């Protein structure tokens, strides 16, 4: 009856309503794992307020907020039901959501897991491919929480810190692509070009050693292997802001370029995230597939469905947690190597926090 | 007895002696697929002349020239012996070397293939991961040869234009890594960090859509899977020159960064080429492993042996060719998609050259 094993699902989060946008931005801009600003305690609230209207308008364009919490909860519930049956010795299992910049915040979830008196806590990132700016930032929040509160954990921690080639995740993407290919006019299907798209990183981050581009490229290859190379593809990158150099090719410039070169039948595949959110519902579906694509003369542009409530995806999550438990690993071998040019002192503390855990 | 199937092994090549350096550079700078320069017919000989002394000195430091022709010949000979047994319907097989910028030049090889009266010719790039700047440039040379001689081919052409995850290539890399791990002191072996290293590309090339970074990342993941994630790794990129932005992290900076961060036992793995050449014998072995690494206080830095004369690598080559023949394929599905921002008119012509071939 009392939960024994807590699976803490980590993600950045998104504002559920338009009223949550300002505080989302403020927590983001206060976070030094992402950015160091001059006079940051002053500029953070200011830039949050400055950007609120633009960002609320994007969310209003997709129906008034992000659905991430809904999807995460449905996935969490399907995962736990499977885990109680796969793993009766670590049952009952209970999921907790720990979002970095909206409620329930990472720190609020840890407080609850400790209150619930769990024996074991698993920090399970919902980003299959690791970036120090996504999963690294969620794992640092766990280390900082105990550091700030000045007490040690009362539960045994470990982390599933990446899973870019999990076989059932791969199957979920391949399945979604095959379904969407069937939605193109039959006479176009062979002609379709696949653009896998993932959020970009600034080159300053790529060049310091961030593991993300190599892992996202691995996911793309395993998906194309599963599909037997039925269509040609490129991996391209979305969401660049600001005037600094980021990893390209850009998704928008790639859609326009393909159109200008006669490839007017394009299937977009979000490959680095597992539910709908602003990047899919606003950036890909509206900004590129409605506005940009209409202006460049595209014939058909479609997007693979996000994994969202697919029961095969819940089965992937539970398979990941079960295999983790059975292996007794505390973290990947990759978490034990920080970036070769890391300049953030917290990363090594975070690494040690996980590699040193009792058990 | 008359040869029936020719396998054209494509590679950029390297100067075999110090005297060949100038004409190597001059052919390279006269190649539009690789670069456009102002007043290129004047500037190419001038830049070749300017760089000759520094490049001759690099080759002198490694014994007086590139061994690429030796290794390519040994691999070609072993591949042909296997193919005559594996594929008697297409035997006898004959290999031909087509180097882009040294003799025997691509154009000289095609001449000899035509004279030999082969039934078919296979353009087999020796770069497992495709870049428009490597394999694309060599395939463009085949299209341009016929275009410039004003005659259609007299043999059926097809291409093996990439093979970044062929299982025996992956085995050869994993085998070389395990052998080199065995040469560290035993007490350091689990502490070893692996840096997979590949020639970089400028960001202008990456951002136009070059398929290379994603393919090299795929090779890395399949090698680490075969090794069961026994050590941690990063993929990083060598050989940047000039002042423009290129894809990082840089290999040199990453070795020094790792050293400064207490990771002093490092295994370098050249992952994008299959024999020794100036990148391994000069840049990694001298510039980085002798000079840089001594300066930064490294404890052990070693390099996986290049594939070179490994018989399992001849077996991979022959298996590639054999599968290619049995499949009847003219080229990969990926060759049918040019880069989304390609601005070189020859790419489409080369693509069509192969996709339109009779059979
Ligand atoms: C200096 C800097 C970032 C630091 C860095 O990259 O190391 C940038 C990032 C966000 C910038 C701020 C935001 O763009 C919002 C403001 C925009 C105005 O055009 C200038 C002031 C303004 C307040 C900016 C000052 C400065 O250029 C900031 C603070
Ligand atoms: C303008 C240009 C490239 C153009 C382009 O990329 O569009 C660059 C590439 C290589 C350059 C040249 C090479 O670096 C060699 C020469 C170097 C000297 O320091 C300047 C003149 C010199 C002759 C350069 C002139 C000019 O800056 C060139 C020609
Ligand atoms: C590039 C990067 C983080 C920093 C980093 O990787 O250095 C990512 C992580 C969270 C991202 C931010 C969050 O998604 C929230 C904002 C979303 C807007 O659509 C752009 C600005 C916005 C503020 C983002 C800018 C940038 O893409 C961030 C800061
Ligand atoms: C960057 C690039 C090719 C062009 C491209 O990618 O746009 C690669 C392909 C062949 C490379 C060149 C060849 O390896 C020959 C030269 C080798 C020297 O060590 C550097 C300059 C040198 C001239 C190289 C510069 C650059 O790295 C080239 C030109
Ligand atoms: C879009 C925006 C500012 C808003 C504004 O002028 O209104 C700014 C605020 C802080 C910026 C970020 C911070 O400067 C930290 C990162 C710095 C990197 O050099 C580029 C991305 C990077 C993640 C920046 C991207 C972007 O230019 C941000 C998110
Ligand atoms: C190293 C060198 C010139 C030598 C010199 O001035 O001494 C120049 C000559 C032509 C240059 C190349 C050509 O300009 C074409 C490419 C231009 C890209 O913007 C960067 C790499 C790129 C491949 C260049 C790298 C490098 O700066 C090269 C190879
Ligand atoms: S920035 Fe990657 S480990 Fe610190
Ligand atoms: S530059 Fe890549 S296809 Fe032309």
């Amino acid at each position: 009856r009392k939960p024994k094993t807590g699976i803490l699902m980590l993600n950045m989060g998104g504002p559920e309503t338009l009223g949550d946008v300002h505080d989302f931005l403020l927590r983001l801009f206060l976070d030094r794992d992402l950015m160091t600003l001059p006079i940051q305690n002053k500029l953070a609230p200011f830039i949050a307020k400055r950007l609120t209207p633009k960002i609320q308008e994007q969310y209003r364009r997709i129906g008034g907020g992000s659905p991430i919490k809904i999807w995460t909860s449905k996935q969490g519930e399907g995962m736990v039901k499977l885990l109680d049956e796969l793993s009766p010795n670590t049952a009952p299992h209970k999921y907790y959501i720990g979002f970095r910049y909206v409620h329930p915040l990472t720190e609020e979830a840890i407080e609850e897991m400790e209150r619930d008196g769990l024996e074991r806590a698993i920090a399970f990132t919902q980003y299959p491919q690791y970036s120090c700016s996504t999963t690294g930032s969620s794992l640092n929040a766990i280390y900082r929480y105990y550091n700030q509160v000045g007490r040690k954990p009362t539960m045994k921690w470990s982390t599933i810190d990446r899973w870019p080639t999990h076989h059932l995740l791969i199957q979920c993407f391949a399945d979604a692509i095959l379904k969407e290919l069937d939605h193109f006019p039959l006479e176009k299907r062979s002609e379709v070009v696949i653009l896998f798209s993932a959020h970009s990183l600034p080159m300053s981050v790529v060049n310091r050693g961030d593991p993300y581009p190599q892992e996202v490229s691995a996911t793309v290859q395993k998906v194309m292997e599963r599909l037997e190379y039925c269509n040609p593809y490129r991996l391209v990158w979305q969401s660049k802001v600001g005037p600094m150099p980021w990893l390209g090719p850009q998704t928008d410039e790639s859609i326009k370029g393909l159109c200008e070169r006669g490839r007017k039948n394009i299937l977009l595949v979000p490959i680095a995230f597992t539910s709908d959110h602003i990047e899919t519902l606003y950036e890909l579906d509206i900004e590129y597939s409605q506005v940009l694509a209409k202006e460049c003369g595209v014939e058909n542009i479609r997007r693979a469905e996000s994994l969202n409530g697919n029961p095969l995806f819940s089965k992937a999550l539970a398979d990941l947690v079960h295999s983790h438990i059975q292996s007794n690993e505390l973290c990947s071998k990759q978490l034990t190597l920080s970036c070769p040019l890391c300049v953030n002192p917290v990363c090594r503390e975070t690494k040690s926090f996980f590699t040193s855990q009792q058990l």
Side-chain angles (χ1 to χ4, degrees), chain A:
Chain A
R1 178 60 43 65
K2 193 194 183 202
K4 177 161 176 149
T5 299
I7 297 100
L8 172 60
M9 294 175 83
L10 296 165
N11 210 332
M12 185 176 69
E16 175 184 71
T17 70
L18 305 193
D20 295 319
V21 166
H22 165 275
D23 283 354
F24 168 65
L25 301 173
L26 174 61
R27 296 188 188 93
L28 204 146
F29 292 132
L30 290 173
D31 186 6
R32 337 276 168 159
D33 291 342
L34 298 196
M35 56 189 85
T36 285
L37 307 174
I39 52 158
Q40 192 157 357
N41 287 357
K42 286 184 177 311
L43 289 183
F46 173 63
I47 297 169
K49 179 149 31 63
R50 177 173 154 87
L51 282 178
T52 287
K54 184 173 269 165
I55 296 313
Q56 285 179 321
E57 167 70 2
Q58 292 186 13
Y59 280 102
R60 182 188 72 74
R61 302 294 310 283
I62 68 167
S66 176
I68 194 53
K69 188 174 153 180
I70 285 171
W71 292 124
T72 297
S73 304
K74 187 179 182 185
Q75 287 153 181
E77 289 188 61
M79 180 187 66
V80 150
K81 51 112 190 167
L82 301 175
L83 281 173
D84 289 347
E85 302 314 315
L86 287 156
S87 189
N89 298 152
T90 52
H93 296 92
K94 176 163 172 192
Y95 82 86
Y96 300 73
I97 296 176
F99 285 139
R100 262 181 298 125
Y101 302 129
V102 292
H103 299 284
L105 287 167
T106 322
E107 295 75 15
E108 296 172 321
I110 287 165
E111 199 175 307
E112 183 185 8
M113 291 170 91
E114 290 220 332
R115 227 149 53 219
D116 279 332
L118 293 173
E119 294 184 19
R120 187 205 293 267
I122 298 168
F124 180 12
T125 191
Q126 302 299 306
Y127 292 100
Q129 302 98 356
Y130 181 107
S131 173
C132 297
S133 70
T134 53
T135 299
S137 176
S138 274
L139 296 184
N140 290 343
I142 298 174
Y143 159 78
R144 222 108 57 168
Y145 169 81
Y146 286 107
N147 206 244
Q148 330 282 60
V149 98
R151 286 194 272 86
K152 295 288 165 156
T154 68
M155 321 164 279
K156 171 263 227 64
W157 280 95
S158 61
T159 173
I160 295 168
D161 50 293
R162 69 203 72 205
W163 38 285
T165 60
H166 189 272
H167 69 294
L168 297 182
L169 169 76
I170 302 308
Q171 185 176 176
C172 290
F173 283 127
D175 287 355
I177 289 163
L178 286 167
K179 283 180 179 159
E180 206 59 31
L181 286 167
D182 283 344
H183 296 145
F184 281 88
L186 176 66
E187 62 269 24
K188 297 293 78 249
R189 185 209 174 98
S190 284
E191 162 59 18
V192 167
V193 159
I194 300 172
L195 285 188
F196 283 95
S197 185
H199 194 296
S200 186
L201 295 171
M203 292 305 298
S204 50
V205 170
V206 174
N207 287 339
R208 87 195 172 193
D210 196 293
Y212 172 86
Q214 184 276 324
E215 286 187 7
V216 170
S217 294
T219 306
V220 164
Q221 197 79 25
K222 279 262 298 210
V223 172
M224 289 305 314
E225 171 179 277
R226 183 167 183 87
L227 291 173
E228 298 177 77
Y229 307 94
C230 53
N231 290 73
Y233 73 87
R234 286 293 195 280
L235 167 54
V236 299
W237 311 88
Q238 57 182 101
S239 321
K240 159 173 184 192
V241 284
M244 299 310 277
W246 285 57
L247 184 59
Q250 298 182 44
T251 311
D252 58 358
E253 287 190 350
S254 298
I255 288 166
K256 174 173 186 292
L258 287 167
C259 198
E260 294 182 351
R261 288 158 183 76
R263 309 309 303 269
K264 288 178 209 281
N265 287 94
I266 298 178
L267 169 59
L268 300 174
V269 186
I271 197 60
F273 200 85
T274 58
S275 73
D276 278 312
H277 56 153
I278 198 69
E279 288 178 27
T280 56
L281 295 176
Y282 182 76
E283 186 184 1
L284 296 189
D285 286 352
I286 295 174
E287 183 175 9
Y288 307 160
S289 293
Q290 296 172 207
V291 170
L292 178 61
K294 184 253 185 282
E295 75 207 22
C296 303
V298 76
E299 295 178 348
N300 295 98
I301 184 169
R302 299 189 73 89
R303 177 172 60 76
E305 189 181 332
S306 298
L307 314 188
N308 289 344
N310 185 165
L312 188 64
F313 180 57
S314 280
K315 179 175 179 173
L317 295 178
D319 184 65
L320 280 157
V321 171
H322 184 222
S323 291
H324 175 79
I325 286 165
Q326 291 179 270
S327 84
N328 228 53
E329 278 174 358
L330 285 179
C331 60
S332 78
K333 179 68 67 166
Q334 284 298 270
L335 195 72
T336 75
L337 172 59
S338 293
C339 296
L341 299 155
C342 179
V343 291
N344 185 341
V346 76
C347 302
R348 179 175 67 68
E349 305 297 323
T350 300
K351 167 191 69 181
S352 291
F353 174 86
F354 287 99
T355 57
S356 308
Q357 287 290 142
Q358 188 178 5
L359 277 259

